[PDB]
Structure formats: C-alpha cells, structure tokens
Design an enzyme around this catalytic site. Structure first.
Site, PDB file in Angstrom:
ATOM      1  N   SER A 135      -9.462  -3.995   0.162  1.00  0.00           N
ATOM      2  CA  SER A 135      -8.881  -3.753   1.491  1.00  0.00           C
ATOM      3  C   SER A 135      -8.444  -5.062   2.167  1.00  0.00           C
ATOM      4  O   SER A 135      -7.433  -5.121   2.856  1.00  0.00           O
ATOM      5  CB  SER A 135      -9.827  -2.992   2.369  1.00  0.00           C
ATOM      6  OG  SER A 135      -9.902  -1.624   1.984  1.00  0.00           O
ATOM      7  N   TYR A 174      -4.967  -6.440   1.994  1.00  0.00           N
ATOM      8  CA  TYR A 174      -3.939  -5.778   2.827  1.00  0.00           C
ATOM      9  C   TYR A 174      -3.862  -6.370   4.239  1.00  0.00           C
ATOM     10  O   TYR A 174      -3.000  -5.955   5.023  1.00  0.00           O
ATOM     11  CB  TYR A 174      -4.160  -4.265   2.825  1.00  0.00           C
ATOM     12  CG  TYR A 174      -3.800  -3.618   1.517  1.00  0.00           C
ATOM     13  CD1 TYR A 174      -2.487  -3.271   1.232  1.00  0.00           C
ATOM     14  CD2 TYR A 174      -4.763  -3.367   0.555  1.00  0.00           C
ATOM     15  CE1 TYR A 174      -2.142  -2.697   0.024  1.00  0.00           C
ATOM     16  CE2 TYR A 174      -4.429  -2.792  -0.657  1.00  0.00           C
ATOM     17  CZ  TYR A 174      -3.117  -2.464  -0.928  1.00  0.00           C
ATOM     18  OH  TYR A 174      -2.790  -1.919  -2.137  1.00  0.00           O
ATOM     19  N   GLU A 180     -10.131   3.888  -5.258  1.00  0.00           N
ATOM     20  CA  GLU A 180      -9.568   4.089  -3.931  1.00  0.00           C
ATOM     21  C   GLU A 180      -9.699   5.554  -3.539  1.00  0.00           C
ATOM     22  O   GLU A 180      -9.883   6.415  -4.372  1.00  0.00           O
ATOM     23  CB  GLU A 180      -8.124   3.598  -3.826  1.00  0.00           C
ATOM     24  CG  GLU A 180      -7.179   4.145  -4.867  1.00  0.00           C
ATOM     25  CD  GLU A 180      -5.860   3.382  -4.921  1.00  0.00           C
ATOM     26  OE1 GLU A 180      -5.876   2.135  -5.147  1.00  0.00           O
ATOM     27  OE2 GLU A 180      -4.798   4.007  -4.698  1.00  0.00           O
TER      28      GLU A 180
HETATM   29  N1  LIG Z   1      -5.046  -0.579   3.175  1.00  0.00           N
HETATM   30  C1  LIG Z   1      -6.158  -0.496   2.445  1.00  0.00           C
HETATM   31  O1  LIG Z   1      -7.264  -0.924   2.877  1.00  0.00           O
HETATM   32  C2  LIG Z   1      -6.066   0.129   1.080  1.00  0.00           C
HETATM   33  C3  LIG Z   1      -7.261   0.435   0.421  1.00  0.00           C
HETATM   34  C4  LIG Z   1      -7.265   0.973  -0.857  1.00  0.00           C
HETATM   35  C5  LIG Z   1      -6.077   1.204  -1.529  1.00  0.00           C
HETATM   36  C6  LIG Z   1      -4.875   0.911  -0.892  1.00  0.00           C
HETATM   37  C7  LIG Z   1      -4.868   0.409   0.409  1.00  0.00           C
HETATM   38  O2  LIG Z   1      -3.574   0.314   0.894  1.00  0.00           O
HETATM   39  C8  LIG Z   1      -2.709   0.749  -0.100  1.00  0.00           C
HETATM   40  C9  LIG Z   1      -1.385   0.846   0.027  1.00  0.00           C
HETATM   41  C10 LIG Z   1      -0.467   0.448   1.080  1.00  0.00           C
HETATM   42  C11 LIG Z   1      -0.770  -0.133   2.309  1.00  0.00           C
HETATM   43  C12 LIG Z   1       0.218  -0.369   3.248  1.00  0.00           C
HETATM   44  C13 LIG Z   1       1.546  -0.045   2.982  1.00  0.00           C
HETATM   45  C14 LIG Z   1       2.581  -0.201   4.054  1.00  0.00           C
HETATM   46  O3  LIG Z   1       2.346  -0.870   5.055  1.00  0.00           O
HETATM   47  N2  LIG Z   1       3.739   0.445   3.883  1.00  0.00           N
HETATM   48  C15 LIG Z   1       4.845   0.338   4.829  1.00  0.00           C
HETATM   49  C16 LIG Z   1       5.392   1.700   5.212  1.00  0.00           C
HETATM   50  C17 LIG Z   1       4.494   2.424   6.154  1.00  0.00           C
HETATM   51  N3  LIG Z   1       4.874   2.746   7.414  1.00  0.00           N
HETATM   52  C18 LIG Z   1       3.814   3.412   8.001  1.00  0.00           C
HETATM   53  C19 LIG Z   1       3.642   3.992   9.251  1.00  0.00           C
HETATM   54  C20 LIG Z   1       2.445   4.647   9.510  1.00  0.00           C
HETATM   55  C21 LIG Z   1       1.439   4.697   8.550  1.00  0.00           C
HETATM   56  C22 LIG Z   1       1.617   4.111   7.302  1.00  0.00           C
HETATM   57  C23 LIG Z   1       2.820   3.465   7.026  1.00  0.00           C
HETATM   58  N4  LIG Z   1       3.272   2.832   5.867  1.00  0.00           N
HETATM   59  C24 LIG Z   1       1.861   0.495   1.737  1.00  0.00           C
HETATM   60  C25 LIG Z   1       0.870   0.748   0.810  1.00  0.00           C
HETATM   61  C26 LIG Z   1      -3.476   1.127  -1.285  1.00  0.00           C
HETATM   62  O4  LIG Z   1      -3.009   1.467  -2.392  1.00  0.00           O
END
Ligand SMILES: NC(=O)c1cccc2c1O/C(=C\c1ccc(C(=O)NCCc3nc4ccccc4[nH]3)cc1)C2=O
Length: 240
Positions: A134, A137, A218
C-alpha cells in the site's frame, strides 16, 4: 488560532497544502491522536514492522503519528455489513493530494471515464495486508518523504479467490469480495483481534500458492459501504 492538538494541526496543513479549524470541518471526520503508550499503537507499530515486504527494499518506514478517524455517517452506512463474517484491518495508500477527498467523501470506486489501468480485478476499492504494498501507492520520494496511509475495517465475508487478472462482471452467488492470492502472506498463525476485527500482522511467509500472478495478496470490495475507515498514519519514508 487553532484549538486542535498540534499533530492534528500538522496533518491538516499537509492535507490542504483558510484557518486550520475551518479546513478541519471540511473533512467531516473526527480525528483523534492515538497515545504512543497504548495497546492500539503497539499493535499498529507491529503491523507496520512485520509486513514490510522483502522486495520493497528502496525504503524503510517510521510511524510519525497515528490517528483514529470516524467519518460522519459511516456508522449508519457500515451498519448492514457490521455483522458480516471475515472483517479485516487492511492497508490503503494514496497520494497526499487525494486525502481531503478521501476523508470528506470516503474511498470511492473509479468512475466509468477513469482508466482501469492498474486494477487487476476491475474497478473497486483495493487493500493490502502488507504495509509496503500500500505504501508504494503514496508515491513519496526522497524530496517529499512523508506520506499518509489508511487502515480500514473491510467487511470481506465470503472471498472470491483469484490468482490471475479478471475484470469480473459480477460477484458469484454468496460472495462479498475478491482476494488476489499472493506468493507471500502474513503468517496466519499470528493474526490477532482488535475490537472484533482480524489484524494480519504476522511476518511474511510463503503462502504455498503456485500458478499466481501476484507476489502479495490484495483484497477488493465493489460496494463503498463495505469499508469503515479506522486509522490514518503519517509515515516517514527513509530511502536507501
Ligand atoms: N492503493 C492501495 O493501497 C492498493 C492496495 C493493494 C492493491 C492495489 C492498491 O492500489 C491498486 C491499484 C491502483 C491504485 C490507484 C489507481 C489510480 O489512482 N487510478 C487513477 C484513476 C482513478 N480515478 C479515481 C477516482 C475515484 C476512485 C478511484 C480512482 N482511480 C489505479 C490503480 C492495487 O492494485
């Protein structure tokens, strides 16, 4: 002049980059400093120490401050899941610039117009049982080495356990969440219970799972109401 404790004042300054107490009220979240001396703090520091993955070796973590949080309305929202089995205290990391939104609106599912990139089980709310998975990120750097990370109570219930990317259209009958199975897991024999929630703070061991795309577990939920945010940590990243 703020009437908040200094650690909370500093948290607010970090999140908003208006007076401090006006900014505080915009979060619609009760924030309390957890006493360093306390059982909760001891458990949380152990969770951080024990679940730093061996392959996340660019930095070590130091807990600066631990806060206990209660978002407005979350007690009534979570109520339908509060009795579901298999409730776990899990990590969620995000960039510091996202926290004003996370605290005011809660964790959200990516909207249709957002890319699915990085979401191996489709758009949902993602958590880890390894702090460093985590923490990655938070996108901290030598130059910006302080980050924020959440601990959420997640109502997982019956987990749909998968080993390879799959953007499932719907959960199977009786299932409440997805778990991606890693090669490495906190030792299940070391799980403890904090306020009725399981805390997987064992050191990492081989899971004995073969034929998987994931180094570490995860956990994904697809309903925003299945998450009760409980703690927010301010972490120092010490880069090597
Ligand atoms: N975040 C964790 O602690 C985590 C823990 C365990 C596994 C994973 C963890 O994080 C993952 C993926 C992740 C995160 C962010 C984006 C993003 O910021 N994308 C941008 C687009 C976007 N816009 C949003 C608006 C609202 C909510 C969500 C949004 N995502 C992409 C993949 C994982 O695989």
């Amino acid at each position: 002049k703020s009437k908040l404790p200094k650690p909370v004042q500093d948290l607010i300054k970090m999140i908003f980059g208006d007076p401090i107490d006006v900014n505080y009220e915009k979060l619609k979240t009760d924030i309390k400093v957890v006493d360093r001396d306390s059982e909760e703090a001891e458990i949380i520091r152990k969770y951080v120490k024990n679940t730093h993955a061996t392959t996340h070796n660019a930095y070590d973590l130091e807990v600066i401050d631990i806060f206990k949080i209660e978002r407005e309305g979350e007690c009534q929202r979570y109520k339908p899941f509060k009795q579901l089995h298999n409730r776990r205290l899990l990590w969620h990391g995000s960039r510091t610039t996202n926290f004003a939104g996370i605290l005011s609106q809660g964790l959200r599912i990516a909207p249709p117009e957002a890319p699915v990139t990085g979401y191996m089980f489709g758009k949902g709310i993602y958590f880890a049982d390894m702090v460093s998975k985590s923490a990655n990120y938070c996108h901290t750097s030598q130059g910006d080495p302080i980050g924020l990370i959440l601990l959420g109570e997640v109502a997982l219930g019956n987990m749909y356990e998968l080993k390879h990317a799959s953007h499932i259209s719907k959960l199977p009958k009786g299932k409440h969440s997805v778990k991606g199975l890693g090669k490495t897991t906190p030792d299940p024999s070391a799980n403890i219970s904090l306020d009725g929630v399981d805390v997987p703070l064992g050191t990492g061991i081989s899971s004995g799972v073969n034929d998987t795309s994931l180094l570490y577990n995860e956990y994904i939920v697809y309903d925003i109401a299945q998450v009760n945010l409980k703690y927010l940590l301010k972490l120092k990243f010490n880069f090597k």
